[PDB]
């Protein structure tokens, strides 16, 4: 398979078609409402903690998981391009963590 493009393309094509994950998650809302309490979000103040609670979407988790999944089936079909690798990204604890 690794000797012929065509052959490998089909391997990859099929490797992907098969992927199926079944996840259950809370309501996007309720999680906000909960951390919202844990941090004490002032609906007037803009602060790190507060801000991130909005870039919180479900679609992201989908994409992320599926990736984690394939990336685990065969290392030679695909690679990921990480976004936002600023010079000092690590000084943003959230992103960092």
């Amino acid at each position: 398979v690794y000797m012929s493009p065509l052959a490998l393309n089909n391997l990859a094509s099929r490797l992907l078609r098969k992927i199926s994950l079944h996840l259950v998650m809370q309501m996007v809302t309720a999680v906000q409402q909960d951390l919202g309490e844990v941090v004490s979000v002032s609906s007037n103040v803009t602060n790190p903690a507060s801000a991130c609670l909005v870039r919180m979407n479900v679609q992201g988790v989908q994409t992320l998981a599926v990736f984690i999944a394939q990336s685990m089936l065969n290392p030679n079909i695909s690679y990921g391009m990480i976004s936002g690798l600023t010079l000092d990204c690590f000084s943003n604890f959230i992103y960092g963590a």
Binding site: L21, H22, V24, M25, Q26, M27, Q62, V66
Partner: peptide, 12 residues
Amino acid sequence: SEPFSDKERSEL
């Protein structure tokens, strides 16, 4: 009503 389940690789 708390958990909404998702089948992934969905074209929502």
